[PDB]
Design an enzyme around this catalytic site. Structure first.
Site, short mmCIF file in Angstrom:
data_model
loop_
_atom_site.label_atom_id
_atom_site.label_comp_id
_atom_site.label_asym_id
_atom_site.label_seq_id
_atom_site.Cartn_x
_atom_site.Cartn_y
_atom_site.Cartn_z
N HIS A 61 10.48 36.46 36.58
CA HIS A 61 11.77 36.25 35.93
C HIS A 61 12.91 36.38 36.94
CE1 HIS A 61 9.36 36.49 32.34
NE2 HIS A 61 9.01 37.74 32.63
N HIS A 91 18.57 43.68 40.38
CA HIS A 91 18.08 42.31 40.39
C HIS A 91 19.27 41.38 40.32
CE1 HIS A 91 18.21 43.76 36.19
NE2 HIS A 91 18.79 42.58 35.88
N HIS A 93 20.66 37.29 38.98
CA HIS A 93 20.53 36.17 38.06
C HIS A 93 21.31 35.12 38.84
CE1 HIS A 93 19.14 38.36 34.47
NE2 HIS A 93 19.77 39.41 35.01
N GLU A 103 25.83 35.79 34.28
CA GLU A 103 25.60 35.86 32.85
C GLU A 103 26.93 36.11 32.16
OE1 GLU A 103 22.19 38.79 32.67
OE2 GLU A 103 21.29 36.85 32.20
N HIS A 116 22.81 43.03 39.07
CA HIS A 116 22.74 44.09 38.08
C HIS A 116 22.03 45.30 38.66
CE1 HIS A 116 22.81 40.94 34.59
NE2 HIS A 116 24.07 41.16 35.02
N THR A 195 19.95 41.83 29.07
CA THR A 195 20.13 40.40 28.90
C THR A 195 18.83 39.60 28.86
OG1 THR A 195 20.51 40.09 31.26
CG2 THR A 195 22.45 40.48 29.87
N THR A 196 17.70 40.29 28.86
CA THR A 196 16.39 39.64 28.78
C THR A 196 15.59 40.44 27.77
OG1 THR A 196 15.37 41.06 30.47
CG2 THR A 196 16.30 38.97 31.24
#
Ligand code: AL9
Ligand code: HG
Ligand code: ZN
Length: 257
Positions: A61, A91, A93, A103, A116, A195-196
């Site tokens: 992911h 991590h 995004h 995000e 994040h 957010t996941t």
């Protein structure tokens, strides 16, 4: 299961995780004109000088750099927080293009990527207990804009080759997360969620006003990662971000005027 594709992306998540349509889902659009300046907000206290990084891995992911959180080594305090929050991992995004990837958006504006730094409230004993509490996690969100290279990011960029596919990991010790912080610690804060999936609503979001810049070639290397496992058909890891969710009965506070 879940992913970021047409058949298993953000729009399908609610089927397996009903909280997807909850009351405090993230990310959100930060409307600067209606965010309320709060003078009772304290400055953030980021103590990352004793941070101990251990590994980096592609989880299918995103890629995550994990830290030793067995002791108060890299903690977050102050701001809208009560208590000490330990850094467990960070991590990113990112998007397939420079005009998308973050995000959270600011006045509907999207950045090239978003960092994040995940922390959990130490009063809960461990991360697993923390995810069962409304104030269990504190995530520091930092926007990345394309511009000049970020020196502190290159070490991460250099190791991506060895963790190209899902499930791969590599030793990643002695990395200093302080090289990823902007100059100013001003922020916006609001109660939200992961957010996941599982999209748990245990997060106090702290989004820094000032973004860090990274070169075109640095973010370019992010896009060469694979969602798939080795030996499987190649699928580039891009656009691993979730669209903005309705703010509902929440207000965004700003630590600055
Ligand atoms: C077993 O219970 C759990 C509970 C939660 C997780 C998620 N893992 S996680 O905390 O690292 C994050 C996922 C997404 C993050 S975001 N994009 O909001 O910062 S943080 C795993 C297992
Ligand atoms: Hg929770
Ligand atoms: Zn994230």
């Amino acid at each position: 299961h879940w992913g970021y594709g047409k058949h298993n992306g953000p729009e399908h998540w609610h089927k397996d995780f009903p909280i997807a349509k909850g009351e405090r889902q993230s990310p959100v659009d930060i409307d600067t004109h209606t965010a309320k300046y709060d003078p009772s907000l304290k400055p953030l206290s980021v103590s990352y000088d004793q941070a101990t990084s251990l590994r980096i891995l592609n989880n299918g992911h995103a890629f995550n750099v994990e830290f030793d959180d067995s002791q108060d080594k890299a903690v977050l305090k102050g701001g809208p927080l009560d208590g000490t929050y330990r850094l467990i991992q960070f991590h990113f995004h990112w998007g397939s293009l420079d005009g998308q990837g973050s995000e959270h958006t600011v006045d509907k504006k999207k950045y090239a990527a978003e960092l994040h730094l995940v922390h959990w409230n130490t009063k809960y004993g461990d991360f697993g207990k923390a995810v069962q509490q409304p104030d269990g996690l504190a995530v520091l969100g930092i926007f990345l804009k394309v511009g000049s290279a970020k020196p502190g990011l290159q070490k991460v960029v250099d190791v991506l080759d060895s963790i190209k596919t899902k499930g791969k990991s590599a030793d990643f010790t002695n990395f200093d997360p302080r090289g990823l912080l902007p100059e100013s610690l001003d922020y916006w804060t609001y109660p939200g969620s992961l957010t996941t999936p599982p999209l748990l609503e245990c997060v106090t979001w702290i989004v820094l006003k000032e973004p860090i810049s990274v070169s075109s070639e640095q973010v370019l290397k992010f896009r060469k990662l694979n969602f798939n496992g080795e030996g499987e058909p190649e699928e580039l890891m891009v656009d691993n971000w979730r669209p903005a969710q309705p703010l509902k009965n929440r207000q965004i506070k700003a630590s600055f005027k």
